[model samples]
Target: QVQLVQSGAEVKKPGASVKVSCKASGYTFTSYWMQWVKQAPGQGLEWMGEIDPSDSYTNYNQKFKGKATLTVDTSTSTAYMELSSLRSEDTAVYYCARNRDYSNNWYFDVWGEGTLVTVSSASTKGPSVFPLAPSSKSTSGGTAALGCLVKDYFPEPVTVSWNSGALTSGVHTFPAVLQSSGLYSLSSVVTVPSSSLGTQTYICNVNHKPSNTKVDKKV
Candidate 1:
């Protein structure tokens, strides 16, 4: 059950910088190396670098040599990558992966979901809400799950909520990450008893105060 979970998407302006995080769980955190990859929209994956979490030593692709910095926190089992002096070329999805080697060489086999970073000079905007969707494993016993993605928000803070026939439980939200273009992205999950699925609809609401904007999606 080892998992490399990453922070959400981000949108930043040109010349700005952003740092993304990946938190690993389920096994000894420092037992393997952690790697980072970059994928521009409509482009192939590029190896950014790899870090030895146990010792904080890193080896980065020559292309990213002075553009990216890698670090780790053993206590929290988290790895971080900071990209600076962003440009439109830096707009891409970045992923953190786990690398292991039994012999002499290492390779990535497990990866974080990825965080999308969009670099642009567009004016500040409120969050954009994606459609709500059910999780692959919708139910385990009697609970049903659903999630939504919110992106392109600005000013660092936003609030999310779920309302559907009166949520029977609390909502789960992830930390928002700053993108190369300066905005933020986040995701959230909510669960309810399976019995309520067909009888009610759910809404994912996102609110940004700076823009006085609110967006909602229904499922």
Candidate 2:
């Protein structure tokens, strides 16, 4: 079960910043070193930096020196990368990996699930959010995906939450996709057991920056 699970997809505008999380588990949090790597569209993987969680020591690749910040929370066993100055060239799939050797050796053993960052400047309209009911799956235990769709928005790096919990897990928010009309569409899904779904009031909280308003939908 040793793994590194990264944060959700993001859609941000230029001149803005986005933070990606890498939650480590199944191993000692401070036992090994970690690094961030990104692959821009059609380009090779470029290592951003290495972070030593034990002492908060970090080293950034020369190319990413001023644009990337690598930090960690030892208590939570999580490391984060915050990138600034979003641009078209910054659109990429970012990843966090466990480094096998501490000093300059490039051998990495474990990789994160990958986070997609899409930098865009499109629609300025507020998004329409919906919380769809849990649909049954064919497998045992009746596990299913609870859906939340956020449609037609812009200049947003949105966050999705559930009334069921906070600092939530099992939620997956995809990067906002720009539609032909210059608007963005995105979805956040939560995997849950379908058996007790009727006993639970599933609430979707789609948080963006309007009135700094909070929007919610229930099923």
Candidate 3:
């Protein structure tokens, strides 16, 4: 049983680049051709390209000719795809598969786990906001401590705040951290009083600068 294992997910900003890997094992690695497939969120599959490991010959889908570059490392039986000039439309899950048929026909018989590449652009999809699990530590008055995590945003300098009914309580906002993939992650926390916990709803709002796009999550 041949196996192809893929790398983990990646988050990148617009105009950036990312490289995804697929390692193969349990078979004659160079005997079979490898192909790359892409499936964008909520969209159908797309054939990006394929590479011949033995001779380094490659064939790419016309749509991805310049945007995607296919390469392989014969020593480790690993295939890599480098995506450059990324945009929101490039956000998708990429998969590598073994080409079973070699006689002029082609089809993937074995596939690797998909690796998701998220391209963040405030001008496109805006920022993503989600509520984190409440912390175990309570406030001095026994209020619940809750956190909101915001990540994968582009064109930096974002503002985060919390709101619940008329109580626009101040929140502890953490500095934005830059990720290796060129995106940013931010977090904020607010203490919810026990008296109003069950009756009120807490909302986390994120305002992305320049684009002026706003995203919110409620808990």
lDDT of 3: 0.82
Per-model TM values vs. the true structure: 0.59, 0.57, 0.58
Q: Quote the lDDT for 87 in model 2.
A: 86
Off by over 4 Å in 2: 102-104, 124-219
How far residue 164's Cα lies from its native spot in candidate 3, in Å, is 24
Model 2, 181-211: lDDT tens per residue?
7677889887777776667677878777842
lDDT of 1 by residue, 144-170 (tens): 777888878875578887783355365
Residue 193 C-alpha lDDT in model 3 = 73
Q: Give the clashing pairs for model 2.
A: none
**lDDT against the true structure, each candidate:** 0.85, 0.83, 0.82
Expressed as tens digits, the lDDT of each residue in 1-219 for candidate 3 is: 679999988768789999999999999889999999999878999999999999999999999999999999999989999999999889889999999876877779999989999787433335677778665555457678777888766645688767733545657888887576566788888877767766877887778864577777886
TM-score of 1: 0.59
Q: How close to the true structure is residue 153 of candidate 2, measured as C-alpha lDDT?
A: 76
